[PDB]
Symmetry: D2
Subunit: 296 residues, 4 copies
């Protein structure tokens, strides 16, 4: 019973592969055609557009970079909504503006289908293993159905409320993360410059009120925690570019809902600075490197 997948990059590729592990035939499409080559070999069908995915697939998933990509993929001249069938389940696991999710939801429900935002927590690793967290928004009746499908790609699938709530939950956590990580980087930098041994300061933080996931699970000072991007030149990880994108969404939503985010705004600008300054492909925890003094 076929499943449609549109967009097969860093999260999409392994996500799409796990659906094949659980035994689903896929109808693939991607605007970068090289990205599909691997799937045509696996036995799966590659098509020429989103509309052509919809014409053959009763329920579809979309893992695209940002809002304009989803607007295009769905509403475009050769988009999904041009040939989506009655009662179809469309799931967008991209991270995009919630307002845009609702807009798409209105246009899908106009077509007699169901739409659900389902952005993801966890990176390329969790994507492969299948331990991603899905934050799901939409008509609650349909959540049962979506859980069946999303559970193949992920270990946690949480209902967040109406369409848009999934994006809002993703965006809020990333903002807190962004803030806490820059904070850890600063507390750590100040302490080291005050004479403390990083390993000990990190200990003190991690047993006190300062403790957070940044300090205890993703520590940005090299030589403190093994297994994290700081141990490995901040390679791979979750990309500064993406942190900045997600922060940018938080800024858009903060402004529109007239929500003051003092620390969040600055987190956004710091990451935006980092991207213009050669950190864009480095892990977001490399904010510590950015704070840390250069020699003369």
């Amino acid at each position: 019973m076929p499943v449609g997948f549109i967009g097969l990059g860093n999260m999409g590729n392994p996500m799409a592969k796990n659906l094949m592990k659980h035994g689903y035939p896929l109808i693939i499409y991607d605007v970068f055609p090289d990205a599909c080559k691997e799937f045509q070999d696996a036995g799966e069908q590659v098509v020429s557009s989103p509309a052509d995915v919809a014409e053959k697939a009763d329920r579809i998933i979309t893992m695209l970079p940002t809002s304009i990509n989803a607007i295009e993929a769905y509403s475009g001249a050769n988009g999904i909504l041009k040939k989506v069938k009655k009662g179809s389940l469309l799931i967008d696991s991209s991270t995009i503006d919630p307002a845009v999710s609702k807009e798409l939801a209105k246009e899908v429900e106009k077509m007699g289908a169901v739409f659900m935002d389902a952005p993801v927590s966890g990176g390329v690793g969790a994507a492969r293993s299948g331990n991603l967290t899905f934050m799901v928004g939409g008509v609650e009746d349909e959540f049962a159905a979506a859980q069946e499908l999303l559970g193949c790609m992920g270990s946690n699938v949480v209902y967040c409320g109406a369409v848009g709530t999934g994006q809002a939950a993703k965006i809020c956590n990333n903002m807190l993360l962004a803030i806490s990580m820059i904070g850890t980087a600063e507390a750590m930098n100040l302490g080291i410059r005050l004479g403390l041994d990083p390993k000990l300061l990190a200990k003190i933080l991690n047993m006190s009120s300062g403790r957070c996931w940044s300090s205890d699970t993703y520590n940005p000072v090299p030589g403190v925690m093994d297994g994290v991007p700081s141990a490995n030149n901040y390679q791979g990880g979750f990309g500064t570019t993406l942190m900045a994108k997600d922060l940018g969404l938080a800024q858009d939503s903060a402004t529109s809902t007239k929500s003051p985010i003092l620390l969040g705004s600055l987190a956004h600008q710091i990451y935006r600075m980092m991207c213009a300054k050669g950190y864009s492909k480095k892990d977001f925890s490399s904010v510590f490197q950015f704070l840390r003094e250069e020699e003369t």
Copy 2:
């Protein structure tokens, strides 16, 4: 074998009581005399100055508000250093500027005594139960001795390095808390205004990369968590005034060490505002009230 205690407020009072529970005679002093009244009843000796505590006590503890108070309590005209005895152990568990800790350390070591900064993590509750964390700085040989004494008032006593490193650790930790608490607050306020139930957003933060002490142990959003100040109009707890003082210490250390603290600076200024806008006596998680429309 007598122990000297100078400064008996919110942390000092219960700390001093726990030393009595483990069976130490106390030589009490406080510039606010009413604060002593309770101890003169318990059988303890109240004196007229710090110098007079030092004249009678071989090892002393000081729990004072900030730097100027410690500078006065020690170096003052009738301060400790006027009558401290050879080989005495002086411990300052105030949260003050590290630089000032070193300056006192130099003046104590001049007098042939030992000084150690030992600021505390945990609030009034931990103080009473005796589960405070002490972050201790000073000459490492002396740490053994200090652990013996501090362990009566606290459950964790950690060596941080040379004199000043304890204040360094307390100050830094409080900055991360402030940044994170305001962070959690901004995040929850955002999500609520985007139409999320707070109990569900907290769940998500807490099973995710956002998780931190502020969000999973001290949530600032009324009705999310039992047994926290947001459950009770932000009474008690750790006060905005004190938070703001501590972040001031961070700001000044950051300046002195030339360390960029962008968020830390905002955190400082936000709590300074709250002190001016009637939050001074509320718990610092009340920053969420301050952002909430």
Copy 3:
């Protein structure tokens, strides 16, 4: 030769009046109908919708609050673009998102008309006297035509580039204004609290590298300058609500163009908080009153 005017609030009312002073018949429309009553008395024609202004007016001006208002006024079910005539000149002097200006520009050009964003500098006063500055974007050949019309309402009309550049010019200015006003407020408060007389600190600021329009022309500290809003409890002036709206524009355009605006972002949030804390109707210079204890 008729001129269409949509939206007659604080800037719109006096702008519309100055076009009557130079001798133009007006075709008025406003979603708040009481706002029109004054013009039906002057002899001018009030209509039921923007579309109905278009049906009667060869060149139209729109002075609306923000983006969605322009999007609706033009593209709406009974909007301008429903009945606009070949070769018409449409001028939007609202302050809105540049991106939205371009979008309307494409939609107007599709209908064989000309569109031009022409936001304004100067307040209600400049509006009345006719000394507003217009920042104008659009196809440069059409600038001559627009200057003829806008010059009735304003004393300076400057070409900024393609459609969107006017909004981008207004938005960047109001961002620098906001940053500098909060700066002046902060600097003055710091000096006052450091024991300076405010009038002296202003003298110094205004003869030195700190001088800016905020300090030498619109000074936020009551009693430093006569005739500025701070001399009359921040009544009238340029509204805190609108400044936040404009800073929201800067913010969202900074995001879209990936432009780091650190102080700018803070300015936005500070003004955001003021709206929620009882400054929304007060002049934007009231940030001083908001900082002061």
Copy 4:
């Protein structure tokens, strides 16, 4: 009638030269001895310490980098106060912590001399020409005397109040400058990236509510204005190191007076970072370079 001058760097050298232009014999000292070599050739006396300046000079001026330097130059083992004479006039035109100015003032007054803080506005250019602004604090009777002397080096000499008020004034002006300059840079960077022509955007800023000294006299965008550091790769001018120093003085005063400074703090932190990143030897207007992609 001899004048003592201690510290002959970027401001000191030309200041000291203007005193020679008005015809004063100078008794020079500087911890960097090469800095003196030029004055030994002019006929002036170089000495081996501040104390040795005081032994020969009835009224002295000190143009040093920061607080510790003044503390040392005055109170040091071979400092001024070791051999200052009755009724002498000591003037410190360094930019330092006001609290430290008062401390010195008390120590000078104890020795029967007068002390006056007199920090300066205007850079290396105004220094040479003699158009610097002096902001003067101290006992008001003595202001007459100091004006006679300072007027040789500067065109404006303003009384600010008691000792420390000069520093107070310098420090709040510079904080406002930092905020506006970063503001301008942010404003200009955002306009450019929204596609404006810079020369135009500056024109608009400079005829609108955004206008300020930063944008109309010292515009950081290369090629908008002639004559400013941004025309010459940000060489010379007013160094990022010193701006960061002055904003550290604002910050520490801001904390000490419990004054909220959200933007001044950010300003401080930005300039801090720029010093960490090889902007230190560059004029402070180089903040535009730093934000720009």
